[PDB]
């Protein structure tokens, strides 16, 4: 006699009738929903490869709020009535890339590429809260995201173009 968990992933309704409390959102996206853009890098919140955006109507604040989270640590059972957005939710080469995806790609901000969706989702989240950020807001947006290939310079140079 268990309740149904209802959430949204990329604008699409997910009704889970047998939610396991131990299921992380990462496991669910990859291995239940088959959305493999979100990555496992550490599973301990330090690397940000699993970054997704979350959205909810805040019963206090009024407002729809947008914020980034680490899918590796988010239990699905915390997400009832929450809207999830992953990298495939914002754009694709099949349809059209988001400006964030295009700019990280063209700016040489992606080598092996495994960190890229995570960094794309942190930048996306920043832009969804603040459409015209400062350069300073931009560098501080990524303290949660690690990249082992690039030395970071190209990524900030590319996202710098969103500022002022």
């Amino acid at each position: 006699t268990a309740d149904e968990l209802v959430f949204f992933v990329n604008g699409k309704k997910v009704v889970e009738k047998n939610a396991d409390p131990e299921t992380t959102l990462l496991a669910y996206l990859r291995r239940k929903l088959g959305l493999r853009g979100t990555k496992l890098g550490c599973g301990e919140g330090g690397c940000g490869a699993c970054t997704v955006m979350l959205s909810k109507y805040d019963r206090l604040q009024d407002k729809i709020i947008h914020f980034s989270a680490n899918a590796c640590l988010a239990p699905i059972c915390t997400l009832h009535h929450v809207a999830v957005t992953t990298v495939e939710g914002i754009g694709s080469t099949k349809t059209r890339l988001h400006p964030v995806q295009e700019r990280i790609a063209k700016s040489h901000g992606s080598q092996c590429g495994f960190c890229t969706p995570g960094i794309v989702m942190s930048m996306y989240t920043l832009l969804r809260n603040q459409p015209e950020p400062t350069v300073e807001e931009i560098e501080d947006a990524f303290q949660g995201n690690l990249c082992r290939c690039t030395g970071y310079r190209p990524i900030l140079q590319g996202f710098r173009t969103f500022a002022k």
């Binding site: 409390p21 206090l60 640590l73 239990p75 995201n145």
Partner: protein
């Protein structure tokens, strides 16, 4: 919103919609684990192989998310995300006179090179406090400022300032089996009251041996004569500790070079580590307890002389 129940192979999760539900559930099942952000519990379950067969998630409860401005300070529900705490404190700092925001700015300093946005968006305030990690960057600051904690169970309600007695042993706090942390009031700074917070920029073990501190001095009106002095350190023991023996000696002394030397000698002795203390870095950690106090010592002088 209504209470939801999820059942897995090993775990039963209850999403509480209401303070009453939370306290009733907590009294019926005192061994139940509160989970808000899961940034500690998820690590405990994955890496330290803990199993908590019963979990309650109180994130929906309005009291646990309430941000209140009173005469004494700013209160935050225990479930407030660190990002909300930080946004509120930045807003307070920009609006209030510098003299009233000494603690707020010390909280913010510890939050500066904390985790990324993804963690700070879900990691709760009450979660960091009750985790009670020896290297928490926040509990030293709360201890130093005497941040007030509201603690509730079914029937019982009580407010206590955080002090040395709150963290009795490793990973343990002064809550009963049936109690939850409700809110946390981060105090306004008074006249002649000054505050600093510092931290080692790097841990090497998961939850020990990273020096982090919160430092408060309150002078007699218009003077440099110590009225109150609180020096609180993480990374120096299996818990957040206060250098009480050292600071008690400085009561009604003057902020001079003589006080500098007396505090450093007190610190070096009271907080001394054995050569094989867990976590090593024995010389460095010693040097940081003193260097951090020196930094406080000089900053206080600049806020005065």
């Amino acid at each position: 919103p209504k209470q939801l129940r999820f059942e897995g192979e090993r775990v039963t999760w209850i999403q509480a919609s209401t303070l009453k539900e939370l306290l009733d559930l907590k009294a019926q099942h005192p061994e139940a684990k509160l989970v808000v952000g899961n940034t500690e519990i998820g690590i405990e379950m994955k890496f330290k192989n803990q199993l908590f067969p019963m979990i309650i998630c109180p994130a929906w409860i309005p009291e646990l998310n309430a941000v209140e401005h009173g005469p004494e300070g700013i209160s935050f529900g225990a479930a407030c995300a660190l990002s909300s705490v930080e946004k509120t404190l930045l807003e307070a700092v920009a609006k209030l006179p510098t003299q009233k925001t000494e603690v707020f700015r010390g909280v913010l300093e510890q939050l500066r090179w904390f985790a990324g946005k993804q963690v700070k968006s879900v990691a709760s305030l009450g979660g960091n406090i009750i985790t009670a990690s020896p290297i928490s960057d926040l509990n030293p600051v709360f201890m130093a400022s005497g941040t007030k904690l509201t603690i509730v169970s079914r029937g019982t309600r009580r407010t206590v300032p955080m002090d040395h007695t709150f963290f009795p042993s490793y990973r343990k706090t002064l809550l009963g089996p049936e109690e939850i942390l409700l809110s946390i009031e981060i105090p306004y700074s008074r006249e002649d009251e000054f505050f600093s917070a510092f931290k080692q920029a790097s841990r090497r073990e998961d939850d020990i041996a990273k020096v982090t501190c919160g430092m408060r001095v309150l002078f007699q009106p218009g003077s440099m004569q110590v009225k109150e002095l609180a020096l609180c350190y993480g990374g120096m023991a299996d818990r957040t500790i206060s250098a009480l023996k050292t600071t008690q000696k400085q009561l009604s002394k003057f902020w001079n070079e003589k006080l500098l030397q007396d505090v450093c000698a007190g610190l070096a002795e009271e907080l001394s580590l054995s050569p094989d203390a867990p976590g090593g870095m024995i010389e460095f950690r010693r040097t940081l307890t003193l260097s951090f106090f020196f930094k406080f010592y000089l900053t206080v002088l600049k806020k005065l002389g």
